Structures are given as structure tokens and as C-alpha cells.
Amino acid sequence: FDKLNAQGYSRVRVDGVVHPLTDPPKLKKQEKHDIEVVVDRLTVKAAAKRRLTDSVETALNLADGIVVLEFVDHELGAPHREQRFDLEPRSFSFNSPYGACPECSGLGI
Amino acid sequence: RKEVDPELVVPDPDRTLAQGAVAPWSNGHTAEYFTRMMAGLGEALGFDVDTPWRKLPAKARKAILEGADEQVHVRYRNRYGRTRSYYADFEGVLAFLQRKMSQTESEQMKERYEGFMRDVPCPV
Amino acid sequence: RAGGHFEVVSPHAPAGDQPAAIDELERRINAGERDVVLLGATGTGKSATTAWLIERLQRPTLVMAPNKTLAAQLANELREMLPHNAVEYFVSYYDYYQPEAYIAQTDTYIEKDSSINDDVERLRHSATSALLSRRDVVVVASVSCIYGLGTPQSYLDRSVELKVGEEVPRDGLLRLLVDVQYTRNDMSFTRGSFRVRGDTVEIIPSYEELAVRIEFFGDEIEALYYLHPLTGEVIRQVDSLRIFPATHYVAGPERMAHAVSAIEEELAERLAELESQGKLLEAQRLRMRTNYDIEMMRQVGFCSGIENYSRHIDGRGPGTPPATLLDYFPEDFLLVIDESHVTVPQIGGMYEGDISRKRNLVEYGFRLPSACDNRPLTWEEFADRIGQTVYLSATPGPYELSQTGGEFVEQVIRPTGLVDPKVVVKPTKGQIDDLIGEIRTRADADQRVLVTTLTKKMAEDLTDYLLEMGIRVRYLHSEVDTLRRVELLRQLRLGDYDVLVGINLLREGLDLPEVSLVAILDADKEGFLRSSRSLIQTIGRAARNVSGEVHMYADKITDSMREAIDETERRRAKQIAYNEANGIDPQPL
Amino acid sequence: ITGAYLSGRESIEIPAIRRSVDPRRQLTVVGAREHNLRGIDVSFPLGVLTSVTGVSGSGKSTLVNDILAAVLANRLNGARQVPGRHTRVTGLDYLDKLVRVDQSPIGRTPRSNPATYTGVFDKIRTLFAATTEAKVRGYQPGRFSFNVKGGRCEACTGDGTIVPCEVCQGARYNRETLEVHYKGKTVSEVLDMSIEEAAEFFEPIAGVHRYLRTLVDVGLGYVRLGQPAPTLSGGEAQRVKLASELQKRSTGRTVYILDEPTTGLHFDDIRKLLNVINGLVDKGNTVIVIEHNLDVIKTSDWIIDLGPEGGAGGGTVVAQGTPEDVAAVPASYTGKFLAEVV
Ligand SMILES: [Zn+2]
């Protein structure tokens, strides 16, 4: 977080609570955190894309392509409108055991 | 590892030695990086730094092939601005290049330079 | 433009005639006379008295310096003496310099080639920002300030104010920042560039070293703070701030259009002149260079050698004085020139040489006559433009004395306890044995002796002879570079030798606390570079020591040297009489 | 072009001065006992269009390229090649720089382009970032490349056309970067525009002007800046650089080692190249060229034949002088070829 403050973000969301980056809360090696830090304090506006892009695209280079638009409000009725930015690539093969029946060795029934 | 021909590292008996007779002595930045202690060893042994090897005997070429043991104090800056300290003992260019193969971080040249002018075939 | 207070920390206590000099200067300067000359020798605290006049006048001040060695020292001392007020520094931002000259006798054409620095242009832009942000500002500058520059009003028009909780669109702020030459660089954060991260923007000015976060909330500034760019240590926080351009030649687009039209006029005139002269190759080279530069900063804005077209930015006609740093100061400002005895003659000689090389360029197809107009200020236009002019030097300059009618103020007396050297005059011949005996007797103190000659041949003959009989000697030549005598300074502070010899490379920043005896050899002969000022300069160099001595050898005696010796002796007598009453030991603070 | 060679009016002897050679200002090589050589003395003149010829594999390449070009490259510009088996090169005080251009069939990867390896694309990005819009949008020259992840959209995957990218619509630039309309054009617009009509562009700015002007001097301004190497025919990969690799320090005796333009370009293209060579040799340049044709080296002023017979039957100089001089000698087949047609 000291390095993050040196870079400059002014936002953070850790341990389930949102803070400015200048305010680091308590952290422990035995404590588990779902770290989902904040990057900005913007909101929806007309013709504000040039703003919101600058909030997300650079984050795409730091969060490894992870960014959401969560409620950060009280009611939390829907789970953040399922808004985030079962599927698996795996590998393509038929004779190889990469993608065949692991038990029957890919042979016919 | 039979290669083409030995003596190919310094096969010139008439060039100006101060003008980089040996290929590592003529690099973009490593040129001076090796010329420093190689001229130091030339001054120590007693063969000239620029005179062609025909006014001098061929013993100059032979003694730059075999060189001598021990090390001397040496350090210089290159054109690129870096500062490398090649502090090692080399027995002439034949073992100096072998030291380059066994020491350098350039995994390409450490086998590029072996082929043209080093002949160490399988004895067994 | 708001007048502040010159909060000066002065732990040094004024002694004796210093207040008398200060209020004499006040009484002279309040009369409104355009010509003022002050005699302040080396070591007399000229910086302190100049700063005191600055405090009393409460006006922006411009200090005129002839070289980097004096200018940098004056700048750092003046910064130290004024904590709160933004003391400044303004010199050419080039370490290596090669002027574009054309020697016709040897047909040698030396082009524009330099070595850009990074720690001096930031100080220049700090100077401009402080000058046009607060009235209580002091700026010390070298001759590069009298070269081409931008107008103060146009550059001030681009300074933009900001505050916490104000209506400021991000797009407009970024456009204004880029228009004042701040390229938005994100991954790399360096001076002249700013980065953006989320709703925050990290900005670094062209004058300050610490970064600043400007945090927004929609189309409105949320807050502003300072931070260290690397360590991240919080210092302070402010509500309002102002931003300034990162180059000195910023103005409105219509001024760019007018400058372009003036460039077209100048290039047409030069092309016609070169076509009449028949110098096709030189005209072609000049035309390609001008097309390149003019088109590429018409499309971008930044180039090399834009100063040649600075006149076109200034809106002034040919032959008029180019806009300089004194225009930045208002008409109610104070200017002072330091070391004027070698600064004003330097101004004249440098203007002559630059105008000769500029004729050799423009006439022989290298630059437009606008480059001739882009020059150090000529003395006629200098007098036409300056106001209450104050001079300051170790010796009374003949030009200053003629301008002032001979009436001056003398403050060369040192309360610190410095006296002029003793004088011994001997014939040119029969001196080497005496010099050897004196150096053998004096070498127990391990000091240094400076000697001079006329030209190189017998000088080097003396050097190798005097290293032959058993003394370590060092010599100076006509092409002395910085390293070869900075190492001399290092090894003399290491005490590695005892004697230096030099002809002309001795008047520029070669200060040494342990030089007692100086020898002048056959300098009585006429010379454009060996008149009385060099002898008085060496006399003062010996004087700065606790106990100086000059050994002066002449075949013939001229009036200049004897009048200089007489005035030096009478000033030394006055200083001794003053110091006999001020017997307190020096107390530096 | 092949017909234009025979009915030339341009592939003629074109008699030069041939006296710009100098008895002292001249390079020599002796004692080269290479496996392909014998140890003969080759006398290279300076300030001329000297051409080294002979049967390939008889030692001409091992002497001119493996020995000479190697030594002047490694200790006259800063290269790394081994000198090889020889003894002497003279005129060290009369030489300043050397440039070697190989045959080099190297165009196979889409990454390599006639503007990317030449070192001009980075300067193009710098110039485009010098625009106000690129400054306000925070786009840097490195950001403004097409190989780094910053400037390439994931939809194209970097190739521009996959049916092209839906977002780019056949332009190979994302919308967040295409907004930079410097001089009314973008990078895609400049790349699409042909160099022949772009000769008026980049005229003020010096380096791109020099590159484009020398490319046009070659006469093949049909290529685009970002042309992928799979679409470039083998042989012309280094021609574009070789255009700018023929005038350094304007002395201009700086020696340039030339490959064979016969590989690829036909004799009319080689005669346009010859016009360029002759013009800048009159300016003062020096070229050492291994060649295969007849009239192109007949235009030259000095011919050196190394080895009449292939293999071990060569390795020795058999002629050195004016092309008509070697033509009169019934020993070098190069001269014999230059003699049957005059
Ligand atoms: Zn795309």
C-alpha cells in the first residue's frame, strides 16, 4: 500500500470496507481478504466517456483485466447487477488424453 | 568440433594491432573493455600495441595466442556509459575466448565465437 | 503582481561604514537618477549590500552577471540569504557550447552544437514563475538573459489559477496544460510531464521537485495536495494554486500567425539578398533549414534555434532591441550589474563578435537577418530601455565613471579584515634567482604562487625550466577546458604543488584561499588583453588573501599601472585605518 | 526492363574520369592464405566504383567481405566479425567509415516492415506524439506502436485483418488512438497513402525526408511503410536501407560494400541504381561491389578480377585497372566479357 500510495490512486477497498488510499486499515498474515480496491469516485454522466475510460482502461493494465461497477450503496438488492468485466478454454484434442474420457481412455462406449 | 581452421582468431601478421586485430577487441562497447587489459598484458610481456607482426616476429602472434597466466589491475568505461569489470585470468586468446564461453551472459556469442576459431574435437 | 515582504535572515551584524554605504546608496537612488555606480571589491559582501538595497526598495530586481561561475555562486548565496522569497537563477541550459560562427580567413564554419542540461532551465522557469507570480522577486541572470526571449504579458496570460471546489472541466484543464507545454506522460513521470490515474492527476511543475495530486469529483476539483515524488512524505496542503508555462515563448494563436507572417517576410528578404549575391549553395542550405524549422514548429511548436524568430513573436521591427529579461520586470524595478568592470566590456566585445559572426552567417547564407536581430542587447538600445541603472564592480569602470561624471560611492573596505597586497617593483631581468629564493623561504607555509607571461613560447620555456630545477609547476593554455583545472583545484586543495602559470585563463573563478605572492612579468607592453584592469584584478586576487604580495617587472613604466598602484595603496591605507578601530575578530554566521 | 537493358541507351560504357584513383590514397591487401585464397595483393582504389569480380568460391567473397569488410566494420564503425586469414589492410589514415549491405533475403515475418527495422517508425511515433491531441490524451510514442499491447486492440490480435476487425473496420487502430489527426491525417492514413504521392510529405522534418528521398532515388516508392514481410519479395528487403547506406559524412569516400543487384532487380533497375551510384560517386562516394552482369560493371571505372578458375584454381589477382584494360588482357574472363561487346 505504500508503493500504491507512491504511484497515486487515492482509492482502496479491502477487508470489505472502502477507504481512501491514504487510510490503510489493519492487515494480518493470518487474515483473509477479498481485495477489490477502488480506482476512482466517478458516476454516470452524459458524454462522460472520456472520464470513465481513464478510470477503467489503465486499471485493465494493473488488475489483469478485472473491473466492476458495483453498487457501493446500502440496499444491495441485486448482486451488483451481476456486472463484471461456467467457462474454461482447456485444450483441443481427440486422440490425446487432453480432452478424452479419462476413465475409458477415450474409446467408444 | 573440427571446424574450419585454427589460428583464425589472430591470423593477421601485418595489421595494426591497435585497430582491433581480435574480434572481441573491436566490439561496439566491449572493444575497449578488452583492449584495456590486453594492452596491459602487451606492455607487461613486451610486444608492441600497434606494430604489425611482420616487423615483429610471428612470436608476437604465438604469444598472443598462448598469452600468460596471472591478472593485473584493469578497469575502464565503454562508449555506452556502462562499467563492466572483466576481472579474470586468461591464457592468451585461445583460453580468453574459452573464458568468454564459460563466463559471459551472452548465450549466443558464447557459441558463435567458438566455431570459427576454436578447434576442440572429441578425443575419446 | 502583488507586493510581498523581503524577509531576509541576516545573522551577520553590520559593522562600521556598512550602514553609511547603505543609506548613501538610498539617498542616491531616491533622486531618480538613471546612472548609478558602486565600487564593491571582492570579499566586501557585495551580495549582502545588494540584498539590503533589494529589501529597502521593495521592487523586483535583476542582477547582471558575465559568466556561469559568478552567477551560480551569487544565485546560491542569494537563495540562502532569502528563505521565504523565491530567489532565482537564469543561465543558458547548455554545458557544452559551440557558437555558429564563420571564420572567413580559414573558411571554418562551426555550426549549432550544444549539450542540453536539465537543472538550469527548471531554475529559469522558476525565475519567470516567481517574477510574474509575486512582486518581491530577485533574479540573477547571465548574458543569456539579454538574448532573445518572450514578452512578460503574453507568458503571464497563460498562467491558470485553480482552487478546491471549483468548476473546471478535465478536458479544458488538460488542453490548457498542453498549451503551456506539459505533455501528459503516464508511465513515466518527469518534469514538464504529468500523469493521470483514475480520478487523480499527478502533476509536477517546471520549478518544483515535489509532485502534487489534484483529485477531482466529476467536473469539479475535489482537493489538491503536495507529496514527495518518491518517498511519499506529506508536507503541507493548500486551497488555491497557480500553474505557469514550461517554456518562455508561449502566447496566443494569433501571435503565432503574426510571427509566421514575419518569418515569411524575413525569409523573403534574405532569399532576395542571397539571390542578388549569387551564393546559391549557402542560400539553399539556409532555405532548407528555415523551411524545416518553421514548418515543423508551425505544426508542433518546439524546435531548435527558435530564438532567431523570437523577434517575430515579440512584434518588434528589425534593429530594435530583442525582448529580454528586463521586460519581465516592470518599469518600477531595480537592476544591478556585478563585476561591471569586466561585464560591460564583455557585453561590448561579445556583441561585436556575435554581430560579426552573424554577418558572416546571414550574408553567407546561414541565417536570416532576424537572427541578427536576435542578439545580445546593443548598448544604445540598452540605455534606451534601462531605467534606474545600478553598477557594482571591484574597480571603477571607465565607461561608468564617464557616465556618472566621476562621482561614485566607495565601500571596498572589508570589515572582515581584508587588505590590499604589498607591492614590489623590479626590472624584468635578474628575477629568477630572487623568485627561487622567495619560494624556498615561503614554501614552509605551502601556499601557491601565480605567474603570468605575454605569449606561449617563453612561458612554456619558463615552465619546463622551473620544473627542471626542482619545483612542481602547473600551466594554463588558450584552450583550457573545465575538467583540467577543476582537477587542478582538487589537487591544490590536496596540496600537490606550489606554482601556477597562466596568461589569460586566470580571471574566471580561479579563487584560492591560500595564494599569497603573485608575479607579473613584462605586462607593461601595450595589449588589447593586457591593459590595467588585469593588473588590478591580480592585485585584488592577492588582496583577498590574509597577506598578499605582488612582484611586478617592467622595462618601461606607464601611467595606468602606477595610478592603479597608487589607488590600491590609498584604499589599503583606508582599509587598515578602518580595521584598526574594528579590531574584533571575524564572526561568520 | 529486360528489353530496355539490351536496347539500352543506358547500359553503355559511360566513360568516367577513371583517374580519381591515387597511387598513395589506395588500399592494399596481401598474404591472405585463406582456404579459398592464395595470398595475392588486391589494390583497391579510393573514390571510385571499383568492382571485384571472378569465379564465385575462388576467394573474392572471403577477401572483400569476410576479410576487408569485417575489419573495417569491426574497427571503423564498431562491428564484431572476425578478420579471417589475411595479413594487411592499408590506408588506415585514409578511411573513416564503412557500410556493408548483404544480399540478405530476410523478409518473412509480418512484424518486420520497411519502416520498423529501418529505425524510422519510432521517429514517426515521436513526431505524431508531438501533436497536441496526442499530448492531451496521454499517448506516447511507445504507446503509439502496433506491436506493444498498449496500442494494439485485442480484436485484431495485432494482424489488422482476421474479414478485418469489426471495431477498426480495416484500419488497424483502435478508436481510442485514431483520434490523433495530425496534419489532418492519422498513422493509418499515412501508411495507406503511397510514398510516390507522399514525397511532398515529411519534407521539412529532416530524417524522414532523407529516408523518403533516398527511397524515391531508388525509384521503388510503391511500398507502404507498414508492409508485412511475407508480402515483400526476397531480395529487396535491404535495398531500402541500402539507399540511405551510401552517403555518410559526405566525404564521401566512406566505403560501401554492395551485394549483387542482379539477384531480384533486373538490369534496368540496376541501371537506375547505377545512376544513383555514379551521381553520389561524383559527389565523392566509394563502392566495392561483387557483381555478375557485364554492362553494369563496364560502366564502372576500375575492375579487379580475383581467380580465373573456380575452386583451387583461383585466389590470385589477374587484373586491376580500367575495364578496357582488363578487357585487353585475354586472361580474366571478366575482361573477355567486357571485350566481346564494346
Ligand atoms: Zn481492431
Swiss-Prot record, chain B:
Disruption phenotype: Greatly increased sensitivity to UV light, mitomycin C, slightly less sensitive to nitrosative and oxidative stress; a double uvrA/uvrD1 mutant is even more sensitive. Single uvrA mutant is only slightly attenuated in mouse infection, the double uvrA/uvrD1 mutant is strongly attenuated at all stages of infection. Transmembrane segments: none annotated. It is found in: Cytoplasm. Belongs to the ABC transporter superfamily. UvrA family. The UvrABC repair system catalyzes the recognition and processing of DNA lesions. UvrA is an ATPase and a DNA-binding protein. A damage recognition complex composed of 2 UvrA and 2 UvrB subunits scans DNA for abnormalities. When the presence of a lesion has been verified by UvrB, the UvrA molecules dissociate. Alone it slightly inhibits RecA-mediated DNA strand exchange, in concert with UvrD1 greatly inhibits RecA-mediated DNA strand exchange. Forms a heterotetramer with UvrB during the search for lesions. Interacts with RecA. This is UvrABC system protein A. It comes from Mycobacterium tuberculosis (strain ATCC 25618 / H37Rv). The chain holds residues 291 to 414 of 972 of the full protein.
From Swiss-Prot, chain C:
Residues 27-413 form the Helicase ATP-binding domain. The keyword Membrane does not apply. Keywords: ATP-binding, Cytoplasm, DNA damage, DNA excision, DNA repair, Excision nuclease, Nucleotide-binding, SOS response. A motif (Beta-hairpin) lies at residues 93-116. ATP binds at residues 40-47. It is found in: Cytoplasm. Residues 431-584 form the Helicase C-terminal domain. GO terms for cellular component: cytoplasm; excinuclease repair complex; plasma membrane. GO terms for biological process: nucleotide-excision repair, DNA damage recognition; response to nitrosative stress; SOS response; symbiont-mediated perturbation of host innate immune response. GO terms for molecular function: ATP binding; ATP hydrolysis activity; DNA binding; excinuclease ABC activity. It comes from the Bacteria. The beta-hairpin motif is involved in DNA binding. Forms a heterotetramer with UvrA during the search for lesions. Interacts with UvrC in an incision complex. The UvrABC repair system catalyzes the recognition and processing of DNA lesions. A damage recognition complex composed of 2 UvrA and 2 UvrB subunits scans DNA for abnormalities. Upon binding of the UvrA(2)B(2) complex to a putative damaged site, the DNA wraps around one UvrB monomer. DNA wrap is dependent on ATP binding by UvrB and probably causes local melting of the DNA helix, facilitating insertion of UvrB beta-hairpin between the DNA strands. Then UvrB probes one DNA strand for the presence of a lesion. This is UvrABC system protein B. It comes from Mycobacterium tuberculosis (strain ATCC 25618 / H37Rv). The chain holds residues 23 to 611 of 719 of the full protein.
